[PDB]
Amino acid sequence: FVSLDSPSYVLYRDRAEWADIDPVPQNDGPNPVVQIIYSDKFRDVYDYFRAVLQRDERSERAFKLTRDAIELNAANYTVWHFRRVLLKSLQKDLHEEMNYITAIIEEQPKNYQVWHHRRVLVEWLRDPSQELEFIADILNQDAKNYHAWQHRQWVIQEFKLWDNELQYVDQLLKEDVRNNSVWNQRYFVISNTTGYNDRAVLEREVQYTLEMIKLVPHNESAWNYLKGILQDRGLSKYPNLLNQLLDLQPSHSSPYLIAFLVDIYEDMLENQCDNKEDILNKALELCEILAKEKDTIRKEYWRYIGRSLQSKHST
Amino acid sequence: SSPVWSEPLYSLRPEHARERLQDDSVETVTSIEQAKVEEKIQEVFSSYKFNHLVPRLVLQREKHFHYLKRGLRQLTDAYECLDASRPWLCYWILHSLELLDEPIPQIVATDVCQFLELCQSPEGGFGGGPGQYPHLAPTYAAVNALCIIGTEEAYDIINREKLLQYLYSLKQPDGSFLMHVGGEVDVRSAYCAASVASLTNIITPDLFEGTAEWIARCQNWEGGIGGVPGMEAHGGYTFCGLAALVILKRERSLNLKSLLQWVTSRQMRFEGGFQGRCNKLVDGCYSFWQAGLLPLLHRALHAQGDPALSMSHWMFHQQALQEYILMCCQCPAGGLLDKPGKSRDFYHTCYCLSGLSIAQHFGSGAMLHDVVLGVPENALQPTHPVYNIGPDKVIQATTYFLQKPVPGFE
Ligand SMILES: COC(=O)CN([C@H]1Cc2cc(-c3ccccc3)ccc2N(Cc2cncn2C)C1)S(=O)(=O)c1cn(C)cn1
Ligand SMILES: CC(C)=CCC/C(C)=C/CC/C(C)=C/CONC(=O)CP(=O)(O)O
Ligand SMILES: OC[C@H]1O[C@@](CO)(O[C@H]2O[C@H](CO)[C@@H](O)[C@H](O)[C@H]2O)[C@@H](O)[C@@H]1O
Ligand SMILES: [Zn+2]
């Protein structure tokens, strides 16, 4: 009706249509702590909100009041919950409510309550039709918004909207190949569709990732995805990979490559490789290089890995 | 060696420059943002070096104390956005004071107890302010604040019978918890529930059925833990997940190898602080959420008889973290912050100090080893890595409540 910052906004205490209900002040006790000295506008809205909540007044006036309470503090989960009680009680048009939450999220996309509210609406409507495009708009403004990604995963899984997501992932990796949220989405799509047990799919993914590593060798996310898609079967189960990285070592001896070699050696030793003593010596040499020169921030981790290898494989 | 008035720093070594970002000549939004932070931080590090003279670093305790003491009474309307988070303000402030070894006056303590009583819901749990619905986040904060106070008055505030009923009212068949009635599920709720239920001795056999398994489903391909199954690994949710599993004695439900490798990877080679997820920016609050995972992992691995564990250090760079916090995260007006250029706030004050204390204090069994960078006065009180209140406060509360029955359950 009238927005909180509109020139014609009137305090609730001055509204004739609210005259019949007494506001309920917040009791902070006689000796308050962490006491927020609210603006007049804030206190006015929340005094009337406390009144409608106390009375459990399920009215159109209470519904409009929640919009103002939300503008004042969109992290107020009590107000959001009451608004949903009213949406149901008053049989409000949920498509109009979807337009409202769309606007609100655009303004405040880093907020748990607004995303949860949207999910409840989509659940109630069983209508995911605006979701992928809307989320894509939020992600256009911040490609790593955690709530946006989480909501996208929910919509896709709940409504089985898998068909175009790998293409979307590819587009965002083209824009920023360092976007870890997108590598995570890549795993989410593949594991839930084809799986990684299909050896043709796994090969496609290993090639794709190695190509990304060649383009941007110090991008941690691609290294992490490579390990992530191979680790459960065991890095040592992929003998060609070791050779390929060993061929890359001299010219591209990054801490990521060197760490990946240690990870391979660790698994090899766990699986009774031939030339155990040789593999152990190479692993310990690399742990020392990482601890002392190439990855010194992780000195304590690399020293632990060295001791761990010796406790398991020395003889 | 060195005179007492100069202390060489890791971030000031000549070879530290080699740790700057290598963008491979491929610029993306990520690398551009990382480089901007690194450039600012290098300027900061340099301001602490005077050729071979490197004065000891100083935690500005008195400035932090005054800032905190003022936040405990009245706040401006700038804090309206935290009107549904008032027990958090109590917890963040009281815990910061506790770390700084600043006594809580009797009158302040009573006033805090009274206010938290007003935030307690008749249905059980605490809301974000008086008359608000209860929510597991301010429930966690209020319980922690009461245990920091640690008086019988504080303990007795908690309605334990209703608290247990409230937790039941949020519990889902898949092991997860809602954050509040009609609210969202994520791993924060499992931790909030496990924390308050263990401190107050209200755990039933039933309460956490399936919860360990659900948390394990949130561990992802990266090795850290996301907010819900499928989601990107994040330090905040990883802390919650592992701490909840430690309380439940179910840490082995996770792959601790991939978790350890992931968290240690989150320490930034140049900045010395931690990022919250791969390829994002350093932030002082991760000094707690990320680095606090290392004492938890140490305990977990030690329980398994791991013969390779250190007897003196956590598995992260304790010195570099202390350097990041002391040089980059202090506001000269008091309070601490995310990174240079950001505004102070009570949340970053709480977690930067908590992370500093973790970095200063190693303990395992009978072995204790402190590394207090800078002037000796920088030493903070220790914090418990599960609950993030003083270990003394944990013991006192748990002992008190263990004397009461689990409500309606024999
Ligand atoms: C115990 O852990 C927390 O409370 C983290 N929370 C916020 C808290 C927060 C508080 C303040 C603050 C505190 C006191 C006075 C003024 C401000 C500032 C920022 C806060 N959070 C955002 C944050 C912290 N570090 C990076 N970022 C983006 C993260 S949070 O409520 O879980 C959160 C809410 N959202 C939407 C995302 N995180
Ligand atoms: C007991 C509680 C309430 C713990 C909170 C645990 C945390 C800190 C969880 C993180 C939740 C979250 C929504 C993270 C996403 O933050 N988004 C960012 O952009 C910050 P960054 O870039 O550092 O990920
Ligand atoms: O970090 C890998 C480790 O996490 C677990 C769960 O504890 O599984 C996660 O990671 C897998 C990929 O490695 C995903 O398939 C799975 O969905 C996810 O929960 C362990 O199984 C795995 O070793
Ligand atoms: Zn932060």
mmCIF file with all atom_site columns, N, CA and C and ligand atoms in Angstrom, chain A residues 110 112 146-147, chain B residues 88 137 140 188 191-192 234 236-237 240 276-277 280-281 286 289 347, ligand 2:
data_model
loop_
_atom_site.group_PDB
_atom_site.id
_atom_site.type_symbol
_atom_site.label_atom_id
_atom_site.label_alt_id
_atom_site.label_comp_id
_atom_site.label_asym_id
_atom_site.label_entity_id
_atom_site.label_seq_id
_atom_site.pdbx_PDB_ins_code
_atom_site.Cartn_x
_atom_site.Cartn_y
_atom_site.Cartn_z
_atom_site.occupancy
_atom_site.B_iso_or_equiv
_atom_site.pdbx_formal_charge
_atom_site.auth_seq_id
_atom_site.auth_comp_id
_atom_site.auth_asym_id
_atom_site.auth_atom_id
_atom_site.pdbx_PDB_model_num
ATOM   1  N N   . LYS A 1 110 ? 21.756 -12.301 0.465  1.00 0.00 ? 110 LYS A N   1
ATOM   2  C CA  . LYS A 1 110 ? 22.559 -12.997 1.474  1.00 0.00 ? 110 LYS A CA  1
ATOM   3  C C   . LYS A 1 110 ? 21.803 -13.048 2.806  1.00 0.00 ? 110 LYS A C   1
ATOM   4  N N   . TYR A 1 112 ? 19.089 -15.950 5.019  1.00 0.00 ? 112 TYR A N   1
ATOM   5  C CA  . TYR A 1 112 ? 18.504 -17.286 5.043  1.00 0.00 ? 112 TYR A CA  1
ATOM   6  C C   . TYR A 1 112 ? 16.977 -17.269 4.896  1.00 0.00 ? 112 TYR A C   1
ATOM   7  N N   . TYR A 1 146 ? 26.009 -18.628 -1.725 1.00 0.00 ? 146 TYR A N   1
ATOM   8  C CA  . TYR A 1 146 ? 25.830 -19.981 -1.204 1.00 0.00 ? 146 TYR A CA  1
ATOM   9  C C   . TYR A 1 146 ? 24.346 -20.355 -1.165 1.00 0.00 ? 146 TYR A C   1
ATOM   10 N N   . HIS A 1 147 ? 23.506 -19.417 -0.715 1.00 0.00 ? 147 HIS A N   1
ATOM   11 C CA  . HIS A 1 147 ? 22.058 -19.656 -0.675 1.00 0.00 ? 147 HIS A CA  1
ATOM   12 C C   . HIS A 1 147 ? 21.465 -19.916 -2.048 1.00 0.00 ? 147 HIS A C   1
ATOM   13 N N   . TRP B 2 88  ? 22.995 -13.612 20.664 1.00 0.00 ? 88  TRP B N   1
ATOM   14 C CA  . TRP B 2 88  ? 24.305 -13.648 20.002 1.00 0.00 ? 88  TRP B CA  1
ATOM   15 C C   . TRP B 2 88  ? 25.185 -12.499 20.441 1.00 0.00 ? 88  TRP B C   1
ATOM   16 N N   . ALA B 2 137 ? 19.706 -21.181 16.822 1.00 0.00 ? 137 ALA B N   1
ATOM   17 C CA  . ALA B 2 137 ? 20.899 -20.303 16.868 1.00 0.00 ? 137 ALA B CA  1
ATOM   18 C C   . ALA B 2 137 ? 20.961 -19.425 18.136 1.00 0.00 ? 137 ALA B C   1
ATOM   19 N N   . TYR B 2 140 ? 21.478 -21.743 21.176 1.00 0.00 ? 140 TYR B N   1
ATOM   20 C CA  . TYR B 2 140 ? 22.907 -22.023 21.356 1.00 0.00 ? 140 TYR B CA  1
ATOM   21 C C   . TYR B 2 140 ? 23.635 -20.853 22.037 1.00 0.00 ? 140 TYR B C   1
ATOM   22 N N   . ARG B 2 188 ? 24.105 -26.423 10.767 1.00 0.00 ? 188 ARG B N   1
ATOM   23 C CA  . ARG B 2 188 ? 24.176 -25.566 11.963 1.00 0.00 ? 188 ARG B CA  1
ATOM   24 C C   . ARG B 2 188 ? 23.249 -26.100 13.058 1.00 0.00 ? 188 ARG B C   1
ATOM   25 N N   . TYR B 2 191 ? 24.577 -29.027 15.212 1.00 0.00 ? 191 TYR B N   1
ATOM   26 C CA  . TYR B 2 191 ? 25.530 -28.543 16.193 1.00 0.00 ? 191 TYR B CA  1
ATOM   27 C C   . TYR B 2 191 ? 24.877 -27.768 17.334 1.00 0.00 ? 191 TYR B C   1
ATOM   28 N N   . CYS B 2 192 ? 23.955 -26.865 16.994 1.00 0.00 ? 192 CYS B N   1
ATOM   29 C CA  . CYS B 2 192 ? 23.274 -26.080 18.035 1.00 0.00 ? 192 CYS B CA  1
ATOM   30 C C   . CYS B 2 192 ? 22.575 -27.045 18.985 1.00 0.00 ? 192 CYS B C   1
ATOM   31 N N   . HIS B 2 234 ? 32.245 -25.765 3.315  1.00 0.00 ? 234 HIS B N   1
ATOM   32 C CA  . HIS B 2 234 ? 32.421 -24.448 3.882  1.00 0.00 ? 234 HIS B CA  1
ATOM   33 C C   . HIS B 2 234 ? 32.901 -24.545 5.336  1.00 0.00 ? 234 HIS B C   1
ATOM   34 N N   . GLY B 2 236 ? 32.378 -22.806 8.064  1.00 0.00 ? 236 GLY B N   1
ATOM   35 C CA  . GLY B 2 236 ? 31.357 -22.662 9.118  1.00 0.00 ? 236 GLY B CA  1
ATOM   36 C C   . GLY B 2 236 ? 30.579 -23.959 9.312  1.00 0.00 ? 236 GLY B C   1
ATOM   37 N N   . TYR B 2 237 ? 30.132 -24.552 8.209  1.00 0.00 ? 237 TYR B N   1
ATOM   38 C CA  . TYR B 2 237 ? 29.376 -25.795 8.290  1.00 0.00 ? 237 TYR B CA  1
ATOM   39 C C   . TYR B 2 237 ? 30.257 -26.992 8.654  1.00 0.00 ? 237 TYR B C   1
ATOM   40 N N   . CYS B 2 240 ? 30.653 -26.864 12.424 1.00 0.00 ? 240 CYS B N   1
ATOM   41 C CA  . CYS B 2 240 ? 29.412 -27.394 13.016 1.00 0.00 ? 240 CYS B CA  1
ATOM   42 C C   . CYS B 2 240 ? 29.313 -28.916 12.904 1.00 0.00 ? 240 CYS B C   1
ATOM   43 N N   . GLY B 2 276 ? 37.055 -19.336 3.812  1.00 0.00 ? 276 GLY B N   1
ATOM   44 C CA  . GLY B 2 276 ? 35.911 -20.178 4.210  1.00 0.00 ? 276 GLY B CA  1
ATOM   45 C C   . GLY B 2 276 ? 35.660 -21.321 3.237  1.00 0.00 ? 276 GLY B C   1
ATOM   46 N N   . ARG B 2 277 ? 36.085 -21.142 1.993  1.00 0.00 ? 277 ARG B N   1
ATOM   47 C CA  . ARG B 2 277 ? 35.964 -22.188 0.977  1.00 0.00 ? 277 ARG B CA  1
ATOM   48 C C   . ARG B 2 277 ? 37.013 -21.946 -0.094 1.00 0.00 ? 277 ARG B C   1
ATOM   49 N N   . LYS B 2 280 ? 38.005 -18.571 -2.374 1.00 0.00 ? 280 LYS B N   1
ATOM   50 C CA  . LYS B 2 280 ? 37.428 -17.315 -1.871 1.00 0.00 ? 280 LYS B CA  1
ATOM   51 C C   . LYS B 2 280 ? 38.438 -16.617 -0.954 1.00 0.00 ? 280 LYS B C   1
ATOM   52 N N   . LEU B 2 281 ? 38.022 -15.521 -0.324 1.00 0.00 ? 281 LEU B N   1
ATOM   53 C CA  . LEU B 2 281 ? 38.951 -14.639 0.377  1.00 0.00 ? 281 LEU B CA  1
ATOM   54 C C   . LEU B 2 281 ? 39.172 -14.976 1.845  1.00 0.00 ? 281 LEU B C   1
ATOM   55 N N   . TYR B 2 286 ? 37.253 -16.984 10.213 1.00 0.00 ? 286 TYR B N   1
ATOM   56 C CA  . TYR B 2 286 ? 37.676 -18.379 9.942  1.00 0.00 ? 286 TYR B CA  1
ATOM   57 C C   . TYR B 2 286 ? 38.871 -18.826 10.771 1.00 0.00 ? 286 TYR B C   1
ATOM   58 N N   . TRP B 2 289 ? 36.435 -20.903 12.826 1.00 0.00 ? 289 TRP B N   1
ATOM   59 C CA  . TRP B 2 289 ? 35.662 -21.994 12.202 1.00 0.00 ? 289 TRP B CA  1
ATOM   60 C C   . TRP B 2 289 ? 36.574 -22.997 11.508 1.00 0.00 ? 289 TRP B C   1
ATOM   61 N N   . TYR B 2 347 ? 30.906 -9.876  16.308 1.00 0.00 ? 347 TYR B N   1
ATOM   62 C CA  . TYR B 2 347 ? 31.068 -11.240 15.814 1.00 0.00 ? 347 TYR B CA  1
ATOM   63 C C   . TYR B 2 347 ? 32.546 -11.506 15.438 1.00 0.00 ? 347 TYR B C   1
HETATM 64 C C1  . LIG C 3 .   ? 26.371 -22.081 15.308 1.00 0.00 ? 2   LIG C C1  1
HETATM 65 C C2  . LIG C 3 .   ? 26.392 -21.255 14.030 1.00 0.00 ? 2   LIG C C2  1
HETATM 66 C C3  . LIG C 3 .   ? 25.200 -20.357 13.699 1.00 0.00 ? 2   LIG C C3  1
HETATM 67 C C4  . LIG C 3 .   ? 27.492 -21.311 13.171 1.00 0.00 ? 2   LIG C C4  1
HETATM 68 C C5  . LIG C 3 .   ? 27.611 -20.586 11.983 1.00 0.00 ? 2   LIG C C5  1
HETATM 69 C C6  . LIG C 3 .   ? 28.553 -21.296 11.037 1.00 0.00 ? 2   LIG C C6  1
HETATM 70 C C7  . LIG C 3 .   ? 28.878 -20.501 9.752  1.00 0.00 ? 2   LIG C C7  1
HETATM 71 C C8  . LIG C 3 .   ? 29.881 -19.350 9.771  1.00 0.00 ? 2   LIG C C8  1
HETATM 72 C C9  . LIG C 3 .   ? 28.285 -20.879 8.557  1.00 0.00 ? 2   LIG C C9  1
HETATM 73 C C10 . LIG C 3 .   ? 28.469 -20.316 7.285  1.00 0.00 ? 2   LIG C C10 1
HETATM 74 C C11 . LIG C 3 .   ? 27.101 -20.143 6.598  1.00 0.00 ? 2   LIG C C11 1
HETATM 75 C C12 . LIG C 3 .   ? 27.085 -19.435 5.226  1.00 0.00 ? 2   LIG C C12 1
HETATM 76 C C13 . LIG C 3 .   ? 25.722 -18.969 4.698  1.00 0.00 ? 2   LIG C C13 1
HETATM 77 C C14 . LIG C 3 .   ? 28.220 -19.220 4.439  1.00 0.00 ? 2   LIG C C14 1
HETATM 78 C C15 . LIG C 3 .   ? 28.291 -18.565 3.189  1.00 0.00 ? 2   LIG C C15 1
HETATM 79 O O1  . LIG C 3 .   ? 28.869 -17.244 3.417  1.00 0.00 ? 2   LIG C O1  1
HETATM 80 N N1  . LIG C 3 .   ? 28.975 -16.538 2.273  1.00 0.00 ? 2   LIG C N1  1
HETATM 81 C C16 . LIG C 3 .   ? 29.999 -15.761 1.984  1.00 0.00 ? 2   LIG C C16 1
HETATM 82 O O2  . LIG C 3 .   ? 30.052 -15.123 0.942  1.00 0.00 ? 2   LIG C O2  1
HETATM 83 C C17 . LIG C 3 .   ? 31.134 -15.654 3.011  1.00 0.00 ? 2   LIG C C17 1
HETATM 84 P P1  . LIG C 3 .   ? 32.619 -16.449 2.300  1.00 0.00 ? 2   LIG C P1  1
HETATM 85 O O3  . LIG C 3 .   ? 32.956 -15.757 0.907  1.00 0.00 ? 2   LIG C O3  1
HETATM 86 O O4  . LIG C 3 .   ? 33.737 -16.334 3.280  1.00 0.00 ? 2   LIG C O4  1
HETATM 87 O O5  . LIG C 3 .   ? 32.078 -17.939 1.985  1.00 0.00 ? 2   LIG C O5  1
#
